[PDB]
Amino acid sequence: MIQEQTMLNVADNSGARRVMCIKVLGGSHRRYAGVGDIIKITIKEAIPRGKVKKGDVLKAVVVRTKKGVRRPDGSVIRFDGNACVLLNNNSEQPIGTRIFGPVTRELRSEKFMKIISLAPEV
Amino acid sequence: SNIIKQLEQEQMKQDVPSFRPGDTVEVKVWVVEGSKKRLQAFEGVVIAIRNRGLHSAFTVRKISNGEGVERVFQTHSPVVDSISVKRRGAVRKAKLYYLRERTGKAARIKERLN
Amino acid sequence: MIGLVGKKVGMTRIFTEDGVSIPVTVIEVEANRVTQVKDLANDGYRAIQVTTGAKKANRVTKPEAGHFAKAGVEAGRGLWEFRLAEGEEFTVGQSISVELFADVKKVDVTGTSKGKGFAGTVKRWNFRTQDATHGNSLSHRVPGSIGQNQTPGKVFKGKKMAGQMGNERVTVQSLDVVRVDAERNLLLVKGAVPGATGSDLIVKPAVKA
Amino acid sequence: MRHRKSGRQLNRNSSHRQAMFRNMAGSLVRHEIIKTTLPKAKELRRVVEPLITLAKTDSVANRRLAFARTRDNEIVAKLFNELGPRFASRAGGYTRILKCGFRAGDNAPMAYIELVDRSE
Amino acid sequence: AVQQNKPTRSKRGMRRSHDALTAVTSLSVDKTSGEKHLRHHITADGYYRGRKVIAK
Amino acid sequence: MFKAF
RNA sequence: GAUGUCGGCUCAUCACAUCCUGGGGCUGAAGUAGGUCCCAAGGGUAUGGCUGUUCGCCAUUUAAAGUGGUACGCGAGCUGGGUUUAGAACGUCGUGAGACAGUUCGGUCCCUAUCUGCCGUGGGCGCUGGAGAACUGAGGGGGGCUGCUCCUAGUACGAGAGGACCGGAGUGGACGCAUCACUGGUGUUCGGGUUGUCAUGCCAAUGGCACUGCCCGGUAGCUAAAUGCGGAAGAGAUAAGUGCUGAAAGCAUCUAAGCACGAAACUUGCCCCGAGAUGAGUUCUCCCUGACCCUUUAAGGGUCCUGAAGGAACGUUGAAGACGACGACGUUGAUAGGCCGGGUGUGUAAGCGCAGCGAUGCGUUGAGCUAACCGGUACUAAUGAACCGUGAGGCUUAACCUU
RNA sequence: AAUUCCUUGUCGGGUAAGUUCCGACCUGCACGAAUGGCGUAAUGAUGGCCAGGCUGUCUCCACCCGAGACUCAGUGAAAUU
RNA sequence: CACAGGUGGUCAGGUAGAGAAUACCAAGGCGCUUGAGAGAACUCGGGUGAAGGAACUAGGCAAAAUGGUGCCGUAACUUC
RNA sequence: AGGACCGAACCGACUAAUGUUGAAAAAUUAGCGGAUGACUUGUGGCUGGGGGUGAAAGGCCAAUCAAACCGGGAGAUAGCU
Ligand SMILES: [Mg+2]
Ligand SMILES: [Mg+2]
Ligand SMILES: [Mg+2]
Ligand SMILES: [Mg+2]
Ligand SMILES: [Mg+2]
Ligand SMILES: [Mg+2]
Ligand SMILES: [Mg+2]
Ligand SMILES: [Mg+2]
Ligand SMILES: [Mg+2]
Ligand SMILES: [Mg+2]
Ligand SMILES: [Mg+2]
Ligand SMILES: [Mg+2]
Ligand SMILES: [Mg+2]
Ligand SMILES: [Mg+2]
Ligand SMILES: [Mg+2]
Ligand SMILES: [Mg+2]
Ligand SMILES: [Mg+2]
Ligand SMILES: [Mg+2]
Ligand SMILES: [Mg+2]
Ligand SMILES: [Mg+2]
Ligand SMILES: [Mg+2]
Ligand SMILES: [Mg+2]
Ligand SMILES: [Mg+2]
Ligand SMILES: [Mg+2]
Ligand SMILES: [Mg+2]
Ligand SMILES: [Mg+2]
Ligand SMILES: [Mg+2]
Ligand SMILES: [Mg+2]
Ligand SMILES: [Mg+2]
Ligand SMILES: [Mg+2]
Ligand SMILES: [Mg+2]
Ligand SMILES: [Mg+2]
Ligand SMILES: [Mg+2]
């Protein structure tokens, strides 16, 4: 469950360290963004000489959440923190060339094949 | 509730091994990637177990690639193929939620040498 | 189409080879005996009245006992009626089992919902609560305004207000029939249904189709 | 809501409620018949009767358990020495409640609660 | 918060129409003691269902 | 007592 | 001899001069996407930064973030930031007291609801013998939103770029209903750890108090963040509109006669209430088959005998409940408690022994304890009765059964 | 600016977005030198603004423990009319 | 008013504590002059909370949070 | 040493909630300020109404203050209701 003002870590090497969600896209009065949901974010902290800079407004896909993900059999997968992967604003493609930490299988879609291929785990 | 008991009983797994909280358990879970089926291992520390007959479940915690992960396995679900106890831990509590605040040396669990 | 009267045994989980978990409500549908048949010439509509279960004969009233004796049936928990279609026909004393739904994929389940008693507007109508701080005085979850001053000078009919919640007839539509087990008089339907465990339940084929 | 809940609050807090029944339980054991309000008598069954069952088998651990729930060695001795042996054959239902009208002071409904084997 | 007109004798009477008390339907008689008592209640001298449950 | 200046 | 302001909050309701969705006519309408006009009010019709602000600007969304009425809706519902009491200061005006839709800092928001209205829930009586059930449905209410992806099809169209109508499928947002099987919350009524102190003679072991002393977990129940379902198809009559045939008016003409099509509007379809529907309905069972007496001799009154079906009361109670009500049960009995077994939760009790100087560890031992849960069991309490309710049910006419 | 009407002046900083805030400019409607001017360490239940921590303030409320509300018995008001 | 108000001196036990704070107690004195049930909305006083963490609001109002001893260490600006 | 520091008694009254026919005609609860001083407090005394007193709010002078209270002029006057 990611809302506005939620702080998320960055699971890619795009240069951003943590970001602020400023809008949950995909509907009207939509308030929760789970794993695999595109969110509009603003970079709050970034490393120097990165490909993104503080204050940039982009969009990202949630890949890990504390609330976890529900499986068809009822099993739940949870993570110690919330993470997201920054995506190009126009083409919605990942900016970083690597993915950090485990990834969840709800991203098994045509547009997120890049993330899974680079995912260290599943 | 005799009817409910019988309905659940006929679909309970009989090969479930005996394990306790603090035990390092490796679980084989069926995973499908396209048409082909596959097995992947999720090894971690059992931090919580609920016994509810067919609805029994247990929580396994592990640190993968620097990120802590917790999986709540439905023990009787066909998705989980097998359960194996790699190590036996000695703890005084049924639930080990306090391990969420610890890592590295502080998260060590003493082995149970009965 | 005709339905049957069952009892809510409870809720249960059904596993499948593919690894999916199906939440199912277990409904016990014993033999439904036809106690009376309604005819157009005599009653003005076509329907069958059926009874299910059994009750102690000591507490059966004389007029109730006489009605069951007419159809040669043992007194049940109660009496329910089902409307008949054009081709349907039944006879007094006939027994209908859970196999009727063997060829049915979706069903309609109706029953009395759990009684919440006197409920406030927040619970009953999902009214938004007012500020818990910032000067609020004894108005944290009160309904608030209920009118528009002199022009109407009244409260309109149907205004949402606190009152009795639940304990009323409720119908849930298009519930999948996971399994029909005739040998034990059981009917497993995906999802939850109104009422607490052991409450009377009426199951009909899905009218919505 | 109060669905499938047990235990009367009796317009008291948990600490006061627990202490009151501890005293009342000892009174019923000390005096085999006592007079109290009907709702209080109904709750007293769920406290005194388990003590009698606990006294069915005599042991140091059981006596200490009885002491922790009564905090009066006189009652503990009474339960294990007399009440326990007397109710050795009864499968529950060690107490009986009889209604005795209403209290004059506040019109509260009153009822006697007594051990079933008070006959002498 | 307060009335704009004085309610009448009539309005007071109708409100009190539901205030009437109901007398006890009947008093049970002990099988042996023979005196009247409330049903499911002991008698004056401690009898109930024919047994002297209370000594006094 | 409210006021309307 | 008082009708309390702006804005916010909560809760709304109506209009249609329609913002989105729906149906159309023109288009300087190729397609996609627009422009303009007509019909349409069923549903839906952003979160934030700044500001007391409405407004407005800006950021990012959305199918769209409609315009208005309702005392510029709503303070006996909340707020009191702005204006508009008394304090104080700035600029400014005045010799001065003081003044300023100039600006600054601070500054008591009372009311237990009689009536109307509304949301719930009962009592009485009626419905023409009484009683127990199941119904018909006049009428009324609820519900009516919509995105994206895929196929059709890279087809129609277009030089290209670009890119469909019409029909299908899948999966979402918001909203609504139900429920706890699952994932979780709560769980001061279940276990365990621990600080200070007091007490049970003391050790050991326990209890009281300190917010449940502070904490860690947790049964049932309730519950959402949890997981099931819902909006519709179809039908009838239509709006704008498009037509067929066709005269008045030899032609033409959708219209005058006569036919056809046509939208989230309308009447139905789906869900709930519903015979106080006084127009009080229908169907099926159950119960009552005695004496007399009086005159104001009539739907008359009264005594005796009788007390049915059924109801109520009382008692044990409920996943029913403010109280009523409603459901279960009362010995020919599992209604509640206890009891027995089991399952849960907590996590190896106490006692004793063994190691250690000791704290402590180990064995007995996954032990002990275990609330509301599950399957059982008359051990306790649900009494033999009393009480209410009667004794064949008006007149008139019609059609039958008849003598 | 406790002073600026025009005015949310203009530029810069902070924010994804700042009528407030900070820095600067001077076009001071209508600052100004003991009815004191400009600075100032420390101090302030003082005014404005930002950040970390923190959380039911909020998204969006859920459950629980108590005192009322509700029922019974006793006593028994009030404004208003 | 048998009113949660106001009213100056003197006496000053135990354990923990720096303490006349605070907690539990001694001597001593009390349970506050309506009770009994129920366990609805709502109000009051509190406890807990998934994910987020000021998005609330005129304003972080209120809550939450920090909290003690030693020792290490501690910037600008300073009238030192 | 200190109108020094932290903090009870003690003296104050910044915030919130409750209460507002209140328990109370100004309080309660949780926080809050000072707490060796321009401190606080007991008993007694002095200042009297166009006067007192006032670290100055037109504050206070017996629940009354832009001129106290009591009695009198007095049946002031009222083109008003
Ligand atoms: Mg107030
Ligand atoms: Mg409040
Ligand atoms: Mg009003
Ligand atoms: Mg009118
Ligand atoms: Mg009480
Ligand atoms: Mg306590
Ligand atoms: Mg007037
Ligand atoms: Mg319609
Ligand atoms: Mg706005
Ligand atoms: Mg207005
Ligand atoms: Mg103000
Ligand atoms: Mg002034
Ligand atoms: Mg003015
Ligand atoms: Mg000891
Ligand atoms: Mg801010
Ligand atoms: Mg400036
Ligand atoms: Mg000046
Ligand atoms: Mg000061
Ligand atoms: Mg009373
Ligand atoms: Mg008193
Ligand atoms: Mg003290
Ligand atoms: Mg309560
Ligand atoms: Mg939380
Ligand atoms: Mg806001
Ligand atoms: Mg605060
Ligand atoms: Mg606090
Ligand atoms: Mg000092
Ligand atoms: Mg105070
Ligand atoms: Mg101090
Ligand atoms: Mg002044
Ligand atoms: Mg005074
Ligand atoms: Mg004169
Ligand atoms: Mg005069």
Swiss-Prot record, chain C:
GO cellular component, one term: cytoplasm
Domain of life: Bacteria
Membrane-traversing stretches: none
Modified residues (N5-methylglutamine): 150
Cysteines paired by S-S bonds: none
GO molecular function, one term: rRNA binding
PTM comment: Methylated by PrmB.
UniProt xrefs under SUPFAM superfamilies: Translation proteins
GO biological process, one term: ribosomal large subunit assembly
Keyword NADP among record annotations: no
Keyword tRNA processing attributed: no
Function of the molecule: One of two assembly initiator proteins, it binds directly near the 3'-end of the 23S rRNA, where it nucleates assembly of the 50S subunit.
Family: Belongs to the universal ribosomal protein uL3 family.
Subunit structure, as described in the record: Part of the 50S ribosomal subunit. Forms a cluster with proteins L14 and L19. In pull-down experiments interacts with CedA.
Protein name stated in the entry: Large ribosomal subunit protein uL3
Lineage of origin: Bacteria, Pseudomonadati, Pseudomonadota, Gammaproteobacteria, Enterobacterales
Originating gene: rplC
